[PDB]
Design a protein around this ligand. Structure first.
Ligand SMILES: *[C@@H]1O[C@H](CO)[C@@H](O[C@@H]2O[C@H](CO)[C@@H](O)[C@H](O)[C@H]2NC(C)=O)[C@H](O)[C@H]1NC(C)=O
Ligand SMILES: CN(C)CCOC(c1ccccc1)c1ccccc1
Length: 532
């Protein structure tokens, strides 16, 4: 009368499982905006120093946007690529000076560089009709570094939340966390749009980043526990796929409304609707059974059978774990580093997460020149993944869950290697090679997440995945400085490091035990002898 058997008797993947999966998918899409970053909320358009006198002259004679930029703004390429043109103003009086539009400023100085440069007061004038956070607070030239501060603070908040948010979810149940965390994320998101100053917005974003990771991973583990053993692959992969679909929808809606405040409010509000949809999904039976609350476990098991429409088995009265467990099974950080096998698995998974994150960031950094439209580039970036999801689904069932991950990691490493050695000059081959590498990285990410979730015991699963994911955020934070520093030593040093890291990760993946068609463990001692 183990949990898996009764779950099989009523139905592994029935009407109930599909219903829960639909709402969990809705939750998954809602996590994309927080993790996308500042791409659609902090895009920096072209900008020049506002000048009161230019407005009067703009209407006197025929003018064009291109023409105005050329012989009204200081020229670029002097003492920097574009530093002068960006945020320097000549300050030559353009008002009460009828010098003809043919020769507005040429006559005065007979030279452009030698003309006087003043402060870039009067705020700024931006190109895009929409408004971004940069445009809101003039974080352009003097405070340009504040954008880096904001993004780095968000990343640090994400790392800390990954390190900490797991324990509350594990100890107090998965439904409770998925409710409180998503509620906090929703109330903060709608609050950010009303943030008056720079500090308040940063604080609200930090809170949202601290909680969203916990929300998403709690949902993931809940659905994975609910689905039967055989169909774990399908549910997990399609959950990640729903996250990608949400990303695509985010790109579309972002193009729809450019204003950042309205975008944030519109993205945040539906999270309250999801919170309304909490009534459906109950607590995971496995967690309740491990916590020794068998009465609620059996009550839930009756409902799923009712919704499935299949008669429940008569043996539920004696439902319990395989062996008589202890009264208390409290999770703790200490328990995560006691069993040598568990310690080895944790180290390997942490290293795999770190390598995946660093290699992904490196690959996106070494890409080609960005396209004219940011939205189209982001849409293609998201679109590349769906074939990756299709490939992952087919191979997991038959090949296993180790060889695909190892080969994908090695493929990403080799893609970086070929990008380095073979001619990297602009060619049609480079874009396809980059897409291949991106596909490999996506496969690595999905496989790592699935295997890590499936490897740990049930009563600590969320905490383990959280800790092993924190290294992903750490690597994402640290890699840019590493790549900038290494470039100084030698021209192509970074790509050699990427290739060696990928090869080592692919080699190390082999030690991890396979998990093809094996019921996920529920006791630490049971997980110790998983390989044997
Ligand atoms: C950009 O601005 C410069 C201003 O110096 C333009 O140079 C002038 O070009 C016109 C013809 O288009 C000539 O009649 C002027 O004599 C040029 N100025 C000087 C000081 O010699 C330049 O053509 C502009 N380029 C574009 C693409 O707009
Ligand atoms: C779905 N594909 C695109 C990425 C899978 O990893 C996701 C990811 C990784 C860990 C936790 C959540 C989501 C990712 C998104 C953006 C940047 C880095 C990682």
């Amino acid at each position: 009368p183990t949990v898996d058997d009764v779950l099989e008797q009523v139905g592994e993947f029935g009407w109930f499982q599909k219903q829960a999966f639909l709402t969990l998918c809705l939750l998954s899409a809602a996590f994309a905006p927080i993790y996308v970053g500042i791409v659609f909320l902090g895009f920096t358009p072209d900008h020049r120093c506002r000048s009161p006198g230019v407005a009067e002259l703009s209407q006197r004679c025929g003018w064009s946007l291109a023409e105005e930029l050329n012989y009204t703004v200081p020229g670029l390429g002097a003492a920097g690529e574009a530093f002068p043109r960006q945020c320097r103003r000549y300050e030559v009086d353009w008002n009460q000076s009828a010098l003809s539009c043919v020769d507005p400023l040429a006559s005065l100085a007979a030279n452009r560089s030698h003309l006087p440069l003043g402060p870039c007061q009067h705020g700024w004038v931006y190109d895009t009709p929409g408004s971004s956070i940069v445009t809101e607070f003039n974080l352009v030239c003097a405070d340009s570094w504040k954008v880096d501060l904001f993004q780095s603070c968000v990343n640090v908040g994400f790392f800390l939340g990954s390190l900490g948010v797991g324990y509350i979810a594990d100890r107090f149940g998965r439904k409770l966390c998925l409710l409180a965390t998503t509620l906090i994320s929703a109330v903060s998101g709608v609050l950010m749009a009303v943030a008056p100053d720079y500090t308040s917005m940063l604080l609200f974003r930090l809170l949202q980043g601290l909680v969203s990771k916990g929300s998403w991973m709690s949902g993931y583990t809940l659905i994975t526990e609910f689905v039967g053993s055989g169909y774990r692959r399908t549910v997990a992969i399609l959950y990640q796929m729903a996250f990608t679909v949400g990303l695509v929808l985010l790109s579309g809606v972002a193009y729809a409304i450019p204003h950042w405040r309205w975008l944030q409010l519109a993205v945040s509000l539906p999270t309250f609707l999801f919170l309304l949809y909490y009534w459906c999904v109950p607590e995971s039976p496995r967690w309740l059974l491990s916590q020794k609350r068998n009465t609620q476990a059996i009550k839930i098991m009756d409902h799923i059978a009712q919704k499935n429409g299949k008669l429940p088995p008569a043996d539920l009265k004696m439902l319990s774990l395989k062996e008589d467990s202890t009264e208390k099974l409290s999770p703790s950080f200490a328990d995560l580093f006691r069993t040598p096998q568990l310690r080895k698995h944790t180290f390997i998974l942490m290293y795999l997460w770190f390598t995946s994150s660093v290699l992904y960031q490196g690959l996106i950094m070494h890409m080609g020149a960005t396209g004219g439209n940011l939205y189209l580039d982001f849409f293609y970036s998201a679109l590349v993944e769906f074939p990756a999801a299709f490939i992952i689904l087919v191979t997991i069932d038959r090949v296993g869950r180790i060889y695909p991950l190892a080969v994908s990691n090695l493929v990403a490493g080799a893609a970086c290697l070929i990008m380095i050695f073979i001619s990297q000059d602009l060619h049609w081959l480079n874009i396809t090679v980059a897409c291949v590498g991106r596909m490999g990285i996506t496969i690595v990410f999905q496989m790592v997440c699935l295997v890590n979730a499936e490897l740990y015991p049930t009563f600590i699963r969320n905490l383990g995945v959280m800790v092993c994911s924190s290294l992903c955020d750490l690597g994402g934070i640290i890699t840019p400085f590493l790549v900038f520093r290494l470039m100084e030593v030698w021209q192509g040093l970074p790509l050699i490091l990427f290739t060696v890291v990928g090869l080592v990760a692919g080699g190390m993946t082999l030690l991890l035990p396979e998990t093809k068609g094996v019921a996920l463990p529920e006791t630490i001692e049971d997980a110790e002898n998983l390989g044997r």
